[PDB]
Design a binder for this molecule. Sequence first.
Ligand SMILES: Nc1ncnc2c1ncn2[C@@H]1O[C@H](COP(=O)(O)OP(=O)(O)O)[C@@H](O)[C@H]1O
Ligand SMILES: Nc1ncnc2c1ncn2[C@@H]1O[C@H](COP(=O)(O)OP(=O)(O)O)[C@@H](O)[C@H]1O
Ligand SMILES: Nc1ncnc2c1ncn2[C@@H]1O[C@H](COP(=O)(O)OP(=O)(O)O)[C@@H](O)[C@H]1O
Ligand SMILES: [Ca+2]
Ligand SMILES: [Ca+2]
Ligand SMILES: [Ca+2]
Ligand SMILES: [Ca+2]
Ligand SMILES: [Ca+2]
Ligand SMILES: [Ca+2]
Ligand SMILES: [K+]
Ligand SMILES: [K+]
Ligand SMILES: [K+]
Ligand SMILES: [K+]
Ligand SMILES: [Mg+2]
Ligand SMILES: [Mg+2]
Ligand SMILES: [Mg+2]
Lengths: 524, 524, 524
Amino acid sequence: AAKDVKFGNDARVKMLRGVNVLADAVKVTLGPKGRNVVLDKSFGAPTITKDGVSVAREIELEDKFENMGAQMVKEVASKANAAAGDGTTTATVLAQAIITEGLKAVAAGMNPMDLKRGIDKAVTAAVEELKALSVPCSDSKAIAQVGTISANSDETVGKLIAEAMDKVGKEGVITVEDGTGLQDELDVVEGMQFDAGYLSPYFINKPETGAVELESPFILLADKKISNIREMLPVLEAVAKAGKPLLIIAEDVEGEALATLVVNTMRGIVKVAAVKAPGFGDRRKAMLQDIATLTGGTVISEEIGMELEKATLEDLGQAKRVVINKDTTTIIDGVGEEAAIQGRVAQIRQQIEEATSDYDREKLQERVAKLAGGVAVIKVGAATEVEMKEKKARVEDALHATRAAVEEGVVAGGGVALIRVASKLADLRGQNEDQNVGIKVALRAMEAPLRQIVLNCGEEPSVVANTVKGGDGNYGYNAATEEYGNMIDMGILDPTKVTRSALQYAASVAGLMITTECMVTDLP
Amino acid sequence: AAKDVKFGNDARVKMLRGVNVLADAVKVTLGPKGRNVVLDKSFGAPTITKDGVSVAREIELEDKFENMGAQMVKEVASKANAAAGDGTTTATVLAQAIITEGLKAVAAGMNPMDLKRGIDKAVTAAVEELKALSVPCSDSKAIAQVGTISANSDETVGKLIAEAMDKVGKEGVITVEDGTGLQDELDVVEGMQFDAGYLSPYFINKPETGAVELESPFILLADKKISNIREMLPVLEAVAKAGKPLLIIAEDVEGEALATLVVNTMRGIVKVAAVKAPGFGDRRKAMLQDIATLTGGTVISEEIGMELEKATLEDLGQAKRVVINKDTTTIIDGVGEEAAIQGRVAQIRQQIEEATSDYDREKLQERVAKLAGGVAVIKVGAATEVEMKEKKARVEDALHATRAAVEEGVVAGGGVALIRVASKLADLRGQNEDQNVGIKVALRAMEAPLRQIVLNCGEEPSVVANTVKGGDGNYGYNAATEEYGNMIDMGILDPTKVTRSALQYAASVAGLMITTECMVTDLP
Amino acid sequence: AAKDVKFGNDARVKMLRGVNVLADAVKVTLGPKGRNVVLDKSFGAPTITKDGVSVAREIELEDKFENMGAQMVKEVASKANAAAGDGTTTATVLAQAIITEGLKAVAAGMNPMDLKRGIDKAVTAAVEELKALSVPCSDSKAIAQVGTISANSDETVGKLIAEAMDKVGKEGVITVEDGTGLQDELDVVEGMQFDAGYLSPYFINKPETGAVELESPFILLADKKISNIREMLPVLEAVAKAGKPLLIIAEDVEGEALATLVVNTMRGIVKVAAVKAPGFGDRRKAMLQDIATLTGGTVISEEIGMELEKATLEDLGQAKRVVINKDTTTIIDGVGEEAAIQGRVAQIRQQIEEATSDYDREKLQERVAKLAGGVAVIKVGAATEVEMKEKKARVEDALHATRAAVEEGVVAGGGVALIRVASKLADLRGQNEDQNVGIKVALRAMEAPLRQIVLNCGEEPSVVANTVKGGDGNYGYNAATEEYGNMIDMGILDPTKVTRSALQYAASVAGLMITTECMVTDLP
Ligand SMILES: Nc1ncnc2c1ncn2[C@@H]1O[C@H](COP(=O)(O)OP(=O)(O)O)[C@@H](O)[C@H]1O
Ligand SMILES: Nc1ncnc2c1ncn2[C@@H]1O[C@H](COP(=O)(O)OP(=O)(O)O)[C@@H](O)[C@H]1O
Ligand SMILES: Nc1ncnc2c1ncn2[C@@H]1O[C@H](COP(=O)(O)OP(=O)(O)O)[C@@H](O)[C@H]1O
Ligand SMILES: [Ca+2]
Ligand SMILES: [Ca+2]
Ligand SMILES: [Ca+2]
Ligand SMILES: [Ca+2]
Ligand SMILES: [Ca+2]
Ligand SMILES: [Ca+2]
Ligand SMILES: [K+]
Ligand SMILES: [K+]
Ligand SMILES: [K+]
Ligand SMILES: [K+]
Ligand SMILES: [Mg+2]
Ligand SMILES: [Mg+2]
Ligand SMILES: [Mg+2]
């Protein structure tokens, strides 16, 4: 198909207009004072949201060149949200700031390559300052605080997350589900999560998360082999009755067992799943007995001399719910006895003094973390057909952001951290003047999040920004209460990874656009 | 698809314009002097109505931004009606008043967040003031009055509902169906209601009430779960041959069974509905047997050796009528014999004294209460197929509204309550002047219903509003007689829950619109 | 879909214009001097009619609001005609008169609800005056006069109906049907009429009259529900042979049997019609046997052990002609032997003295009437085929009006009755000036029919109307001869029911329109 082709300022004005439409719609939702955006649906009542992620998702423009501008910033803000677990709106706001001032610099006749070079220096320096400024979120109050803020200032979800981490630990397994109720609840059960992918993708019963979930299934294991389904027939029958879906994990299902198994999944008479299996050769024998011990099942191998034919209905392990993702598979609430599981822990704990290398004490300790750790499950319990599918996606991210806080720490929220970092970078310089202007472009942008938050309050960004800059450390503006004070004490905490990611992705796309001389698309 | 995006004033103006079209069309039907609105049908003759609910449902605008505004206020008003039983027109009048003045204030440049806080504060206080002003509906007279008003001053309706509730008791089952002749019929038959909904919303043949209406349906009671349609084949074919619909009650309906029971229900089934049997264990079995004895059906259990394919036409129960809501299933006039039914009730009572648990006594009680209770049936009299369906519409409405009156009590109608509450709030204040303006916005709006009623009479809203304000307590304007008096003595009563719910929902959407900076929709 | 929404004056002029197109097309055909209206057909020569009912049927307008106006008045005039058996044109004329003057009053700023109140009051008064003015229609001479006027001064039609009533009585059953050449026949035969409709409208072999007609059909009488066609199969094979169409009278026909027969009559090569037996309980089984005695057939019941599959050719009764409308079924000339029938009658007569309730005595009385009453068959002869059908249609029309004349009596035609009642209401007043204007609106409108009749003559409506007003009693204008005189002596008679209904229905829709503030319809 013949193409529409634009060059230079022509290309860039259209990108900028498209960026402007995207960012102007998204930025109004930033901070506790965010305005509402009405989003139309094909039929029925419109959706009304303060959520920048939902707003960005709907933006697409008629003009193709403008549209490319918007999709560029979207993709990049979307990557920040997936890496850090939050920051989409912040990343979008920053991107518009850098792009706008950057293109003014290009239009004045300044070297774009130098402009981009100075922006990058500023960002690399800004990222180090953030790492310096950061402080640990080690503590229940703080974790709850950060959770609450990633939760859109919802205490309950912040309380839940900090509650989960208390029981299962900071790096412990935590999963998000629906459940039945108008309110959200938390449960801590026996289960584990190891990295195994689906053997075939078509197992997936839920395309949204691209994962498989079976309800009250059975678990199978190897060992051997599995070359042929002929020995998979007898155990498939008994599982057919009782209406309980079957799960087969290990090990290395191949041939028609790998193939003819995936056929019956597409047809509605069967529900089955398979996984990439344990970390073997030798260690799989350890991992499997761990799974079997958790699921209350038995491990039947040909090595020992046992056959898959003799395997009975009770020979299988069991769990309440199972989830198999692309790279991962999780077991929720195994039915294995606690006396069994507990003794299996001690058996592995002896091997710690029995370990002749640092490499073994890692693995075996990773196993005791799976069995002894358990799995904390939170049920969103937002009651609606539409409200459920959504709130599960935000809490899933709110959990990701808290994890990010626990890893790389936290900094003063409300755009204060970026304001502070920019003040420290006041002396930073480039190789030439154009690189210098680039640097100042980045440093000006770092004020945009605070300014926008304030503007959404109906107060004057100039005055508040000035007042905050005139202060020190974690002093900031609390946009909920309209008062200044210590941001950390006030509990307004950004995960450092989130602030960091927002700026980096923002600056990425902005460098790209500032360095863009040509666009190609389809004819109108 | 590419989107049309508007911001700020340009957006709010279009939204307000769509609200005006909706409200101006709905509000002229308010009260006993309501004007007619003519609504077209693609075929046949136009519908002429004073019912705000019917007018609202038809409104959709060509301009997509205007339409979003209309749909926003519609949803909120129907949420109110769904919660309180009545008040759609009132809610819309209130929404228009709050939005209009609120938007005027925003255009003047006041802080929209503060405006919303002000409105919210006035409503919260108004709601309490309303609860205090409220009075219980104790007896048949006041109950009749409430029904009569919700019936558009039809005293025969109020009389019916008062008598229906007298027979079944104020806590108990009352349904309504088309009558065979000019006269009204009130009879109490054998029936029952438990809590289960439809498994899929597509089962709804009546979009207005969102309910599944099935006339002379066969009832399948299954003690198992159905994931597969192939075993439902011989049973269904028998049903499609008899020219009757089918209600499926089992453990669950899923897999291809559901999906097939959905699409096939659209054309060639030609009608079927299925609900999840309430409870579990021996309770779920015992409840199914209750339903079987009522409809003269036989429960299918796998443990007795019975199968679905061996199920004949006489293993299916039968009832005159069955209705299914999202949370509810109602079986009216089972064919089951007395002796089987009476033999059953004497059996559960015998289970009371044998029962060793106080919990079991209350649980077995709920079962005898349903079998011995039966269901009250109201058949709407005459006079023609279109007139009937309108009267059946009113009786249902009045039924809902009378409920609400029972729970939360009543207040003076004619918009007098909101007028009184407003005058009590004269001294209310906010944190700043903008919140004050918001409070005055809400208080001004609380005069909208009375004024509109008066305006529909062809009188002058200012003069009447003034006179009522100068009066005291339940003193008001009777718009039917155009005479002032005591609203309670004149039998003009609104359920407090209705007035409350209307103000709240209206204020909810208004606050949303006052705080909206951006709208996204499809291209024209 | 998006809607077009109009308000107030903008909405009302469009309704008015639509009413004007409908009314101006219909009203030119009023009375003996009515002008021709030409109605197109997709092929061949146009239809030329002086019949208002035919003109009104064809009117539909492009502008969707104008169309709404017209359909509203059509529905109402149509309702009048169905109730009283004539008056469509009169009602349409009255409706236009009230609407036109009423809207003039609205535009002047008068209270629309008061205007309606005033119109309503004058109408109920006029209805009482019509009842007072009404005179009995008893003698064959007055009856034939009534029939003649309904027939457009066809004195042959009036004579036929009068003759028919001289035999079966004034409440007797009368059917008209295609006769032999040129010569009318009237003969009373064994037969009856009960209320049952066609179960499938597709059964109709006469799309115009809207009724199914079976010639010398067999008649099946079954006391059970026919579901499976297989039970019905052998009884059909006997009907397939002998080439005698079948009439199935059963408790009901549904499912496989319904859809099976309904389609087979469409494809041709088969003739069948199904109707449900009237009443329920024991009264249903009695009336079935009634039809069985009349047709000389046998009732097939489940109780005595009679099987529908064992029903032989002699089990079925026979009629000469059978005519099934949507409302009623008529069996003409049953084959049942006189001794049979009259024995069944004396059996009922006995039970009439045995009745312990006056409900039975009325019901049993109804039956003997149908059995011993017989049916009058009017056979219309004509010079040509096309000349026969229209004369037949003239008789069917006049039959309706004649019955109405018999029930409620007669008044002076030519719109003199309405003129007289109006002059008598001159002092009538309402609660205020606006109500007074409404009354005058109605009173002025009552002159519209005479004026229009005179206008179709080509004379001056003011002069004739003024002269009639100047006289008393039944003095009026004869439009046929263009002379004044006594309307009753000249045989110009309106059934009081017709005049009353036309006025009532016209005032109904007129008040509705005078009170409409909003119209909602589809976009063009
Ligand atoms: N009480 C508060 N005062 C000031 N800033 C706040 C407050 N609560 C949250 N914020 C800020 O709002 C920002 C998050 O806004 P949000 O609308 O979630 O955009 P994003 O999608 O980028 O997270 C963070 O920078 C956070 O510090
Ligand atoms: N005789 C009356 N005098 C004054 N107000 C009345 C009278 N009858 C009903 N109303 C008022 O009409 C309102 C309900 O009117 P309606 O048109 O049904 O609107 P909605 O759909 O909001 O209930 C109530 O506020 C009630 O008090
Ligand atoms: N010879 C006559 N002189 C005056 N009026 C007549 C005469 N014959 C019939 N009419 C009147 O014509 C009217 C019937 O009009 P028609 O054309 O049948 O329309 P509609 O459907 O209203 O009956 C009646 O009011 C009747 O009295
Ligand atoms: Ca749309
Ligand atoms: Ca610059
Ligand atoms: Ca139409
Ligand atoms: Ca104001
Ligand atoms: Ca603003
Ligand atoms: Ca002349
Ligand atoms: K937000
Ligand atoms: K109303
Ligand atoms: K302020
Ligand atoms: K005519
Ligand atoms: Mg966030
Ligand atoms: Mg109401
Ligand atoms: Mg006529």
